[model samples]
Target: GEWEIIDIGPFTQNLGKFAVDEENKIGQYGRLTFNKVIRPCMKKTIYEIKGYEYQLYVRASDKLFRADISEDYKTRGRKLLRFNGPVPPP
Candidate 1:
């Protein structure tokens, strides 16, 4: 199989909470937090990984604290688009 390079840009951050606490008078406590901001200037790029007639998207971003990539492809009854492989190396 051959790997293909896809479009690249400033990868967007997944601005969501890691954990939430709702049993106190204080507001919900977020174990992990991301500022609700999307700076177009902080774009990243993604690539296509190929393996035995299949491929998946990959990318690296800095909006958060670490790098990330797409999961591997899988099958479910008849659905061809599934993720079931280890995440790409950081």
Candidate 2:
């Protein structure tokens, strides 16, 4: 796992991010696989992230730490994200 700041049309997230694979039958926990298809690069410049929603992986030593950090590696109960600030790039 590594640190990254992807540019997805809106904002960003600091987590152990990967990529959206099309091989997962149901994806995360066999649920709604209909997720954000991030770009090739997880991290980008301040004015980058020319796309839509992104998949963010949380960390342990993160200031924005919370529950459900991962599948079964660590962390607490069910959780979700609520980021702010986003006018949607043109």
lDDT of each: 0.25, 0.28
Error of 1 at 18 (Å): 8.7
TM-score of each: 0.21, 0.20
Query: In TM-score terms, which candidate is top?
Result: 1
Window of ten residues with lowest summed lDDT in model 1: 15-24
lDDT of 2 by residue, 4-79 (tens): 6445443332222222121123243332222242343243222232222333432222222111122222332212
**Model 1 misplacement above 4 A:** 1-11, 15-30, 36-64, 75-90
Looking at model 2, the pairs that clash are 7-49
Per-residue lDDT tens digits of candidate 1, residues 1-90?
A: 334433232222221111011111222222323332222212122235221222222221222322223333442111123222224333
| Per-prediction CA RMSD (Å) | 11.9, 13.9
TM for candidate 1 is: 0.21
Worst 10 residues of 2 by lDDT: 60-69
The Cα error of candidate 1 at residue 60, in Å, is 16
